[PDB]
Design a protein around this ligand. Structure first.
Ligand SMILES: O=S(=O)(CC(F)(F)F)Nc1ccc(Oc2ncccc2-c2ccnc(N[C@H]3CCCNC3)n2)c2ccccc12
Ligand SMILES: O=S(=O)(CC(F)(F)F)Nc1ccc(Oc2ncccc2-c2ccnc(N[C@H]3CCCNC3)n2)c2ccccc12
Lengths: 406, 392
């Protein structure tokens, strides 16, 4: 046995969870009969620790920002206790420990981004988002696990009426996760909240690819960031889920910080839509364009590059029972995105009246039904989502697109 | 003078309530500090032990710190703006407050925790957060019971709770055959719902006679107008929540699914989904028979006589709409929603914009339509399409 007791914190010095700069050690421990991680801080880091703890409180909490419990202080050290977690996201991905924990990659990214949006809403820029500082919780009483943002060491609270900070104020971040504007030769624009969106974009790809980075292996990574030399080749170019992820990630890691979406904007992206929501979008689009002119801006935009999206004739690329069922309505043009969406809407709307064989090939509503189409037309959602930005201001489409408040 | 006990400090002059509750400080956070006497030490330990497991949820109060000196024990929780009693007696929407309270209750019940003492004094209203938002939180874990896994009932106890007025009849009367379950909290919550929406009335009357009226089943929900949509929906929920038969009271998750909580958009979507679902149904089949049972009263004999003239004019294009039919009223609503952009300006103007004003056009004129339709369409509650609207 070995236990150190400092006020309300106890820990086992043999149970080391990690090590930092300036002699910092993290141990497994207990506080108020709760499992905790206990960080021991040296005198030189007392002012540093007080600042970050102040910030991790003084700030409203959120489920996806790590819970801070207790500080204690003896003659030699300070101790900070936070909730004990199962893993870092780095450990989770590097070990491919999916069977053990069971947390879905999209949900963990949604949770991380919700935590990020919360920090940004408090005028807090994190500046050090990376898989090592995204923590994965222990299962709750219902077996549920969540991602939480940690490590507030580089965080900046921007003053009221300040929307940027100096790139020389402290350490720039962690090599390989630093936005190009932090280290570029020319300081064209001061860094903003979008430094975290860049880092988050790299994290998204890291999680979805199961361990690759958009800017390559560690040795060349930060140099590649400065060059803008990325590859997202783990994302299949003709797979719906990957096409959608690529469309988002490309914007998140854009070299121009002003082209990166805000955290709340990222949360609205189709990457995060349920299957039901994806189908509802297609239905809403089809209803919106049903009486639209073929030569108007909406249909022209929807049909621009449309032949690739429908694979020249979409009737070739659907199962035979559906082909048979669609011969009744000879007004569907195989070359048309509008008409594919019309066919989808028609079969969704009349689903109960369709023959058993047609219901069977489509699968049930909404999940299997929408996958029938997205599995066969991998660009259809991404293309349509882009094209229908023309209607993004309309009340019907406000659920699908992001509009910033001021 | 400020008392310091470990991490907790307070000025003894700064009393929030009475055991004494002070305003104090813990880790540079404003807190409420309860001082516990020796007689209550085990009681305090039990409730704190239980609360560490549920605080966590945003609608269950956050527990911060305990201390113990030679004479007393101290418990610190977040400082709140008000109790729900204070809030009602003296900018959160009332429905949202009740949704939040119910979400906190559902969380407790999901952990097999029965509260047993829910009342407006025990629902705390937070201080505004950094974006000005306030929320309700369940507090006072003194009588909470954690049921063993797979166990649903517990014993009545003489003096649980000590203060009358909000207690389900099966908690008190030995005449009740069945022991109390989690549904005691739904009863209490039912009374709270009515208290909030009525702005201070109680279904079982003034404070003195409340508990005796509870035992008799003598309630009145007369603040809820019988021909106003919002009140018809609230009454239908509340009357189930305060039912004398505990097994007829809906679970907390069931309450959360009730139309009481639906946005106007969601009310409209339900109508649309219903109309789509019954479009190819036979008139003699059980779905449409159920929907048309009592239907003439719901449509006020002829719904075409109870809509505005521009809409009447617009609907005579489809001469096959039956004025006595609920199904056809719902068909008209769905048709006009679907074709809204193509309607003449005068018709768009009378209906109002989609979805909010549009659905209110109909629910204001046919106050029983949603309540009726929701009841009738229970026949489809198992179907995937109706998963938004019912709990199973
Ligand atoms: O977020 S902070 O800014 C909070 C403030 F503001 F209050 F200081 N700083 C901290 C950041 C991170 C920490 O924790 C850790 N550091 C390094 C490595 C691991 C961990 C950690 C944390 C939780 N669980 C587990 N579990 C292990 C189990 C076995 C498998 N690997 C995961 N590990 C901190 C710990 C204590 C105090 C502060 C920490
Ligand atoms: O929920 S419990 O079971 C937690 C456990 F399990 F940890 F004990 N017990 C407790 C229940 C309730 C308490 O709080 C209060 N009691 C009585 C009166 C007031 C308050 C209170 C609480 C917070 N804010 C404000 N503000 C005033 C401002 C002026 C206008 N009225 C609202 N008041 C508790 C306080 C400390 C400790 C325990 C409390």
């Amino acid at each position: 046995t070995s236990v150190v007791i400092v006020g309300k914190i106890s820990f086992c010095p043999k149970d080391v969870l990690g090590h930092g700069a300036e002699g910092t050690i993290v141990y497994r421990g207990m506080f108020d009969n709760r499992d905790v991680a206990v960080k021991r801080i040296l005198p030189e880091c007392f002012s540093f620790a007080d600042r970050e703890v102040q910030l991790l409180r003084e700030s409203d909490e959120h489920p996806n920002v790590i819970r801070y419990f207790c500080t204690e202080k003896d003659r030699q050290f300070q101790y900070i206790a936070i909730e004990l977690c199962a893993a870092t996201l780095q450990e989770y991905v590097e070990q491919k420990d999916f069977a053990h924990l069971g947390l879905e990659p999209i949900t963990l990214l949604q949770q991380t981004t919700s935590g990020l949006a919360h920090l940004h809403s408090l005028n807090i820029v994190h500046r050090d988002l990376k898989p090592h500082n995204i923590l994965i919780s222990m299962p709750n009483a219902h077996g549920k696990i969540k991602a939480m943002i940690s490590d507030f060491g580089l965080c900046k609270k921007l003053a009221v009426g300040r929307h940027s900070f100096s790139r020389r104020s402290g350490v720039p971040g962690t090599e390989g996760w630093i936005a190009p504007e932090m280290l570029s030769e020319d300081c064209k624009e001061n860094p903003t909240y979008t430094v975290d969106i860049f880092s988050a974009g790299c994290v998204f790809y890291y999680v979805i690819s199961e361990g690759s980075h958009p800017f390559g292996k560690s040795l060349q990574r930060q140099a590649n960031i400065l060059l803008g030399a990325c590859s997202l080749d783990c994302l299949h170019p003709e797979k719906h889920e990957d096409v959608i992820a690529r469309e988002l990630i490309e914007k998140m890691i854009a070299m121009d910080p002003q082209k990166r979406p805000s955290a709340k904007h990222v949360l609205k992206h189709p990457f995060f839509w349920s299957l039901e929501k994806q189908l509802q979008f297609f239905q809403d689009v089809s209803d919106r364009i049903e009486k639209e002119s073929l030569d108007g801006p909406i249909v022209k935009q929807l049909e621009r590059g449309g032949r690739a999206v429908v694979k020249m004739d979409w009737r070739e690329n659907i199962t035979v029972p559906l082909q048979t069922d669609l011969r009744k309505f000879r007004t569907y043009k195989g070359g048309s995105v509008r008409d594919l969406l019309r066919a989808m809407r028609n079969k969704k709307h009349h689903y109960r009246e369709l023959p058993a064989e047609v219901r069977e090939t489509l699968g049930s509503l909404p999940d299997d039904f929408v996958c029938y189409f997205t599995s066969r037309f991998p660009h259809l959602l991404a293309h349509t989502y882009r094209a229908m930005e023309l209607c993004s201001h309309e009340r019907l489409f406000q659920p699908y697109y992001f509009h910033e408040p001021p």
